[PDB]
C-alpha cells in the first residue's frame, strides 16, 4: 500500500492507488525505476484515465527521464511508450481534492542499450575473447561481405582486426595489417588490399570499410571513402571457409599460437557479415542500419562484456517553461590595481564578453562585492563577488565554469583565481495554505491550482528570484478569485453544482471545522432550493459521509445535519407512488398517503442480498428487518380538517450510524440501536389513542436487557437536542435482538 517506492526488478508492473477503482484524492506518488549502468528503462501505459484540465492543473502524471519532463492527464498518455535516456525513469502522480477517475496501469521493462549506440575497445591480452556468440552458427562460406567502422589509438607493424578460426582452432579468415601492410588472410593464402587502404589510415576518427570476396573469381572488393575497388586474388580460389567457427574482434590473425599483444589498439563499430559478395551498386544502397545476414551488430549475436562498450555521437513540463534559465556564480578575483578602478564594471563586461565569444546568450543581471582582503602588497586585494548569470531563451554549469576558467585575464592586474557556478534551485513543492498544493517550479514560472473547493476559478503562485543573494523563493499565493466553503451564495441554478462539490470533499478526512461549514452550506442549499431526486441524492450522501466521520466532528454539526435532512424530505418533489434515496449509512423515503382510504400502514428498512446499502419496504415488514414502523388505522382520527388536508405523504428515514444523536445527559445510558424516523408532514401528530409500533433492531446482543424507548426531542438542552422518554413505552415482543416501542405520537 505504498506509492513512493524504488523499483529495481528487470520487469514489472505498478498501478495508481486503488486501480482499477478510482484513485483517492490528494495523492502524491514517486515511483522511481532504476536499472544498472548499461540499461535504459522503457515504460508502457497499459491503461490511463485522469481528470482532464487545461495545463493538467487538476490531476497530472509527470514522466521524468534524465533530459526531459512531461505532464499528462485526461486520456492522453493511454497508448504511450516512453524511453529513458539514462538508467533511471521516474513517474510521479498527484491528484487534487475532488473529482477522481480510474487512474493507470504502467508496465516497466529494463532494456539494454543497442550495440549500434556503442563502440568497442579491442583487447591487448588473451583469454579476453570478444566473439560472435554460439547462438549464431557461421555457415560454409564461398563468398562474404564484411563491413565495420574502425578507429585507432596507436600504431604497430603487425595488428589484427578480425579473426575467424575453425572448429579445430587454426585461423581461416583474418583481416590484419602485416609486414606488407593491409592484407586479407583467406584459408592459407594472403590477399593484399594495400593499394586501396593501408595503416596510415588508422585515424582516431571512425570511417566505414567493406571487404568482399568470392571463391569463383578470387575477386576481392574494397569499399573505402566512397570509391569501389577490385582486385583478383587467384590463390584464394582453392579455399572454402568451413562451418562452425569462432569469429572474434581483433584476435589471433595469421599466427600459430598467441594473440597476446598481437592486436590493434582502438575502437570498432557496426561489425556485420553477409553470405554473398555485394556489387558496388549494392554497396551504395547500404545504410549503417541494415542487418547483417550472418552476424549483425546487435547484442544477441555477440559476447562482449560491459568493460569494452562506450558511447558516442502548451508547455510540456510540469515545472513550467520559463523564458530564461538563471545561474548563481561565486567569483574569486585578484586585483593588483585596487585604488585605481572599480573592478565590478571590468568583471561584468568581461563576463558579458566571454559568453558572446562562444556565441552563447548568457548575460550578467546583477553582481556585488562580498569580501575584500588585502594580501602582501597593500594595493593587492583578493575580492569575492556574487553574480547572477541569465541564459536568454534556451530550452550546463560546468561548461560555464570552463569558459570562464579558460579566460582568467579579466583586465590588467585582474585575474580569476576560482569560479563556481550553480544552477539556480527550483522552488520546491509546497502546500500553502491547506488544499493549495503547488508543484515544483523553475524560477519566474507561475503555477495555477484550483480554488478550494468549488474549482470554478484558479489561484496562482510565482517562484521568484531574490535579487540580493540570488536564491529563489515562493512569493505569496494570489487567492483573490477564490471562495471559501462558506462564502458561496446558493441559488436554484448553482445548487446542483455546490452540492456535487461538497459531496466530493466529504469522502476525505475532513477537519471538524470544515465539516460544520459543509453542513451549514447544505442547510442553506436545502432551504433556498427546490428539491427533486438527483439534488436530494447528492445531499443525502453529504450527510452519509459526515456520518462516518469521528464523533467529535459530527457533534457540532449534527443538529443542522439532522434538521437539513428533515426539511429535504418535506420539500422533495417526486412523481411515482414512492421515492427512495439511498446511501451507505442513510436511506430516506417518501410515499404518497391517501387520507380518505387510510386503513393503516407498515413500513420497513432492510439490506438485501449482497447489497451494502439499506433499502425501504413501504408495504410489508421485510425479512430480517432492521427497523419496522407500523402506523395504526386510527392515526388521523383526532386530527382537525385543517390538519388532515396538510397530510399528503409518509416519510421514512433509517440511520445506519448513530453519531448524529449524541446525548451527554443520558445518565450513562448508551444508544444501542439504529435510529428510525417517520412523519406524515410538517407537523407532529400527538396523543394518539392507539400507538405507533416502532420496532428497531439492536446494534449488539444483550441477554435480558432493560431497554428505554426514546424519541429525539429538538427542544431539549437549550434547543440543541436530546433523547426523550415521554410518550414511549416498551411493547411485549422485545427480545435480546430487537426492541418494540409503542409511542403515542409520530
Amino acid at each position: 500500500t505504498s506509492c513512493n517506492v524504488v523499483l529495481t526488478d528487470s520487469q514489472g508492473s505498478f498501478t495508481s492507488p486503488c486501480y482499477p477503482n478510482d484513485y483517492p484524492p490528494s495523492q502524491s506518488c514517486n515511483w522511481t525505476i532504476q536499472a544498472p549502468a548499461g540499461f535504459i528503462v522503457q515504460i508502457t501505459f497499459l491503461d490511463f484515465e485522469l481528470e482532464e484540465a487545461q495545463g493538467c492543473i487538476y490531476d497530472r502524471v509527470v514522466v521524468k527521464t534524465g533530459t526531459s519532463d512531461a505532464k499528462f492527464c485526461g486520456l492522453t498518455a493511454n497508448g504511450l511508450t516512453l524511453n529513458s535516456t539514462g538508467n533511471v525513469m521516474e513517474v510521479f502522480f498527484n491528484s487534487d481534492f475532488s473529482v477522481q477517475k480510474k487512474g493507470f496501469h504502467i508496465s516497466y521493462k529494463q532494456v539494454a542499450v543497442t550495440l549500434r549506440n556503442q563502440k568497442v575497445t579491442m583487447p591487448k591480452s588473451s583469454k579476453t575473447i570478444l566473439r560472435v556468440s554460439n547462438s549464431i552458427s557461421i555457415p560454409v562460406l564461398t563468398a562474404f561481405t564484411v563491413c565495420f567502422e574502425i578507429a585507432r589509438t596507436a600504431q604497430k607493424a603487425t595488428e589484427t582486426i578480425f579473426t575467424l578460426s575453425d572448429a579445430a582452432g587454426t585461423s581461416i579468415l583474418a583481416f590484419e595489417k602485416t609486414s606488407n601492410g593491409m592484407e586479407l588472410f583467406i584459408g592459407a593464402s594472403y590477399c593484399s588490399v594495400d593499394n586501396f587502404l593501408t595503416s596510415s589510415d588508422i585515424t582516431a576518427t571512425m570511417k566505414p570499410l567493406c571487404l568482399t570476396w568470392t571463391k569463383s573469381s578470387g575477386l576481392i572488393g574494397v569499399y573505402f571513402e566512397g570509391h569501389y575497388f577490385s582486385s583478383i586474388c587467384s590463390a584464394s580460389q582453392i579455399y572454402t571457409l568451413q562451418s562452425g567457427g569462432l569469429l572474434q574482434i581483433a584476435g589471433k590473425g595469421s599466427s600459430s599460437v598467441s594473440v597476446d599483444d598481437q592486436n590493434l589498439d582502438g575502437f570498432i563499430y557496426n561489425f556485420r557479415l553477409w553470405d554473398h559478395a555485394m556489387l558496388s551498386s549494392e554497396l551504395s544502397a547500404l545504410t549503417c542500419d541494415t542487418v547483417g545476414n550472418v552476424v549483425d551488430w546487435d547484442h544477441s549475436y555477440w559476447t562482449i562484456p560491459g568493460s569494452s562498450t562506450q558511447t558516442d555521437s502548451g508547455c510540456a513540463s510540469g515545472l513550467g517553461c520559463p523564458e530564461d534559465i538563471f545561474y548563481r556564480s561565486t567569483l574569486v578575483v585578484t586585483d593588483e590595481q585596487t585604488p585605481d578602478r572599480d573592478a565590478t564594471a571590468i568583471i561584468s563586461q568581461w563576463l558579458n564578453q566571454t559568453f558572446q565569444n562562444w556565441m552563447y546568450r548568457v548575460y550578467v543581471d546583477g553582481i556585488s562585492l562580498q569580501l575584500i582582503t588585502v594580501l602582501s602588497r597593500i594595493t593587492t586585494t583578493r575580492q569575492i563577488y556574487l553574480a547572477l548569470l541569465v541564459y536568454k531563451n534556451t530550452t550546463a554549469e560546468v561548461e560555464i565554469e570552463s569558459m570562464l576558467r579558460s579566460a582568467p585575464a579579466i583586465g590588467n592586474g585582474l585575474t580569476l583565481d576560482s569560479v563556481t557556478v550553480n544552477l539556480m534551485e527550483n522552488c520546491q513543492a509546497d502546500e500553502f495554505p491547506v488544499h493549495y498544493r503547488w508543484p515544483e517550479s523553475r524560477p519566474t514560472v507561475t503555477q495555477y491550482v484550483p480554488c478550494f473547493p468549488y474549482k470554478d476559478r484558479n489561484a496562482s503562485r510565482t517562484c521568484m528570484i531574490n535579487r540580493d543573494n540570488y536564491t529563489s523563493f515562493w512569493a505569496l499565493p494570489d487567492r483573490g478569485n477564490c471562495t471559501n466553503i462558506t462564502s458561496i451564495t446558493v441559488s436554484q441554478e448553482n445548487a446542483m453544482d455546490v452540492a456535487v462539490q461538497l459531496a466530493d470533499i466529504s469522502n476525505n478526512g475532513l477537519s471538524k471545522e470544515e465539516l460544520t461549514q459543509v453542513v451549514t452550506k447544505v442547510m442553506e442549499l436545502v432551504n433556498i432550493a427546490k428539491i427533486n431526486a438527483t439534488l436530494a441524492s447528492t445531499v443525502v450522501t453529504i450527510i452519509s459521509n459526515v456520518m462516518v466521520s469521528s464523533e467529535d466532528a459530527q457533534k457540532d454539526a449534527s443538529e443542522t445535519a439532522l434538521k437539513a435532512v428533515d426539511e429535504l424530505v418535506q420539500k422533495i418533489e417526486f412523481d411515482g407512488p414512492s421515492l427512495t434515496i439511498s446511501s451507505k449509512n442513510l436511506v430516506v423515503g417518501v410515499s404518497a398517503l391517501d387520507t380518505t382510504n387510510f386503513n393503516g400502514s407498515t413500513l420497513s428498512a432492510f439490506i438485501a442480498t449482497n447489497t451494502t446499502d439499506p433499502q425501504i419496504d413501504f408495504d410489508s415488514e421485510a425479512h430480517n428487518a432492521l427497523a419496522v414502523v407500523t402506523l395504526p388505522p386510527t392515526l388521523l382520527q383526532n386530527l382537525s380538517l385543517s390538519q388532515i388536508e396538510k397530510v399528503s405523504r409518509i416519510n421514512f428515514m433509517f440511520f445506519g450510524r448513530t453519531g448524529l444523536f449524541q446525548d451527554h445527559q443520558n445518565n450513562g445510558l448508551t444508544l444501542n440501536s439504529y435510529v428510525v424516523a417517520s412523519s406524515v408532514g410538517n407537523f407532529t401528530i400527538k396523543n394518539l389513542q392507539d400507538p405507533v409500533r416502532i420496532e428497531i433492531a439492536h446494534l449488539e446482543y444483550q441477554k435480558d436487557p432493560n431497554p428505554q424507548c426514546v424519541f429525539w426531542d429538538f427542544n431539549l438542552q437549550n434547543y440543541s437536542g436530546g433523547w426523550n422518554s415521554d410518550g414511549c413505552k416498551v411493547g411485549s415482543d422485545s427480545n435480546s435482538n430487537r426492541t418494540v416501542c409503542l409511542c403515542n405520537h409520530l
Binding site: 439532522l562 439504529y674 439492536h698 436487557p705 428505554q708 424507548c709 424519541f711 433523547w723 416501542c741 409511542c743
Partner: peptide, 7 residues
C-alpha cells in the same frame, strides 16, 4: 420523529 433505544 426520530426513535431510538437506550440501554
Amino acid at each position: 420523529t426520530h426513535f431510538g433505544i437506550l440501554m
